[PDB]
Amino acid sequence: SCCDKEIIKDVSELTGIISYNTEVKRWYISVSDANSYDNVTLYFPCNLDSKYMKEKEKVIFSGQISKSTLKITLPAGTTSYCINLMSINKIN
């Protein structure tokens, strides 16, 4: 895995929205928890192909997640992980 920290688990076929964090200058995939006020998981891929580096791009993805190492300002309810993408495809 491209992630520094040990693999926690594998995530399979999650649906998220791609965006860029200007603070750490890194792309991430955002997955919100339906029906919650503010539960969001950010997945920071260390192997994202430039083809998917587009704002608000919707993807279906799978990969190995690890604890994030990034010094990032997160709102409450938002957690972040590092991800080694195994599959990623544009949707709609």
Binding site: S19, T22, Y37, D38
Partner: protein, 158 residues
């Protein structure tokens, strides 16, 4: 986790949602801060000029803080824990339809939840708690902080 080191906390409403009358937004926000001030030694004052401790913003999509809203659906708001600058600020997704009661997202209940985060609370594992992650509508007259919410906020502020 960080807490406000002072008990006199100011908030400012940066802008208003067009979904609700300005007085209804004011009321919901004032009553949401009142929920928390009733069980802690914290005092909240609304200011209209200068830098407030807690800035209340209504915005859609990307709005300058690296945590873009997601349009209609998904999450409803987000807030930052105590600290300077963005710390304490509560942002509400303008792509949501904010309401005084139900038939949309209830601003009062969402503000109670977000202000709990502004004050340093995380989520609760008690389904009755306002800090429980799931959006649950209850009428403002019936609404009460759960014992878990009270224990959580008093653990931080007394």
């Amino acid at each position: 986790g960080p807490v406000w080191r002072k008990h006199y906390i100011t908030y400012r409403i940066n802008n208003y949602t067009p979904d609700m009358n300005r007085e209804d937004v004011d009321y919901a926000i004032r009553k949401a801060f009142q929920v928390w001030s009733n069980v802690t030694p914290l005092k909240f004052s609304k200011i209209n000029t200068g830098m407030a401790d807690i800035l209340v913003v209504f915005a859609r999509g990307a709005h300058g803080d690296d945590h873009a809203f997601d349009g209609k659906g998904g999450i409803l708001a987000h807030a930052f824990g105590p600290g300077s600058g963005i710390g304490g600020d509560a942002h509400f997704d303008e792509d949501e339809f904010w309401t005084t009661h139900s038939g949309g997202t209830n601003l009062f209940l969402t503000a109670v939840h977000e202000i709990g985060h502004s004050l340093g609370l995380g989520h609760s594992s008690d389904p009755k708690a306002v800090m429980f992650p799931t959006y649950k509508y209850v009428d403002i007259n019936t609404f009460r902080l759960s014992a878990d919410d009270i224990r959580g906020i008093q653990s931080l502020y007394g």
